[PDB]
Design a protein around this ligand. Structure first.
Ligand SMILES: [Fe+3]
Length: 275
């Protein structure tokens, strides 16, 4: 049983070093554009009062197509002038070192293909709607864009054994599933939540999960689960705080956490500050 990444990339090559390729525009059907249109309108009706304001405005400022899979090159004209970043198409999942290298150079990899109609909510493997709709708009906030860039640079430098899981955890709990407390109430900045119907509602509506204040060392030592609703969400007060977190060189931090047993995705640590 071949995964969608394989079926979608048949007859398509990718750079051996950075896994990029020109966006294969001819490969989007009429149905894919309708699938995109459906995803897009469904999220936009859920996000008011949910997504943080920066996300909403980035969507507006970049003019992410509402009715068809965006043309990466066109979007880049705006994204580059506004933030200094560009998106590059990748075939699907790429190696971490290649991913860190892109972020370090203000390139955001985006899986080019779209989920098939039979699918629809945060399926196995991220796709263009998740990657583009969920990740790209926030780059409109210069501090969050600076955070991503610093995160990639730290990744390029990481050597210590155990560092990769720690950085995967940090990325997951901020970039993919992060929440942000605002004067108007708790909001969302995580891509894995913003491109998902179910997660968008759950992360702000459920009594079950823990909602914990951002804490760097705690996060890097916290497991996460892939196919279920998150059991813990980490909350930042501002993007600056997120950026400031990348200020220290992480080298000694990996060594400190290296032998620690990690927290379960559902645990509450002694030093947590919980909602
Ligand atoms: Fe993602």
């Amino acid at each position: 049983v071949p995964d969608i990444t394989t079926r979608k990339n048949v007859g398509l090559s990718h750079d051996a070093n950075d896994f990029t390729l020109p966006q294969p525009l001819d490969r989007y059907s009429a149905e894919d554009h309708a699938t995109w249109a459906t995803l897009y309108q469904r999220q936009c009706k859920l996000l008011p009062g949910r997504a943080c304001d920066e996300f909403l405005e980035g969507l507006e400022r970049l003019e992410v197509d509402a009715d068809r899979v965006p043309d990466f090159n066109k979007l880049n004209e705006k994204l580059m002038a506004a933030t200094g970043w560009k998106i590059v198409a990748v075939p699907g999942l790429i190696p971490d070192d290649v991913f860190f290298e892109h972020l370090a150079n203000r390139r955001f990899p985006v899986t080019w293909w779209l989920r098939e109609p039979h699918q629809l909510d945060y399926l196995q493997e991220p796709d263009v709607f998740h990657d583009l709709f969920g990740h790209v708009p926030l780059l409109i906030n210069p501090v969050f864009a600076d955070y991503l860039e610093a995160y990639g640079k730290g990744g390029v430098k990481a050597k210590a054994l155990g560092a990769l899981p720690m950085l995967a955890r940090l990325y997951w709990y901020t970039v993919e599933f992060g929440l942000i407390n605002t004067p108007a109430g708790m909001r969302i900045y995580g891509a894995g939540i913003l491109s998902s119907k179910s997660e968008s509602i759950y992360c702000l509506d459920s009594a079950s999960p823990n909602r914990v204040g951002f804490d760097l060392m705690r996060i890097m030592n916290t497991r996460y689960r892939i196919d279920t609703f998150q059991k813990t969400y980490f909350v930042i007060d501002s993007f600056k705080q997120l950026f400031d977190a990348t200020a220290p060189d992480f080298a000694p931090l990996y060594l400190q956490l290296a032998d620690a047993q990690p927290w379960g995705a559902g645990d509450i640590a002694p030093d947590d500050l919980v909602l």
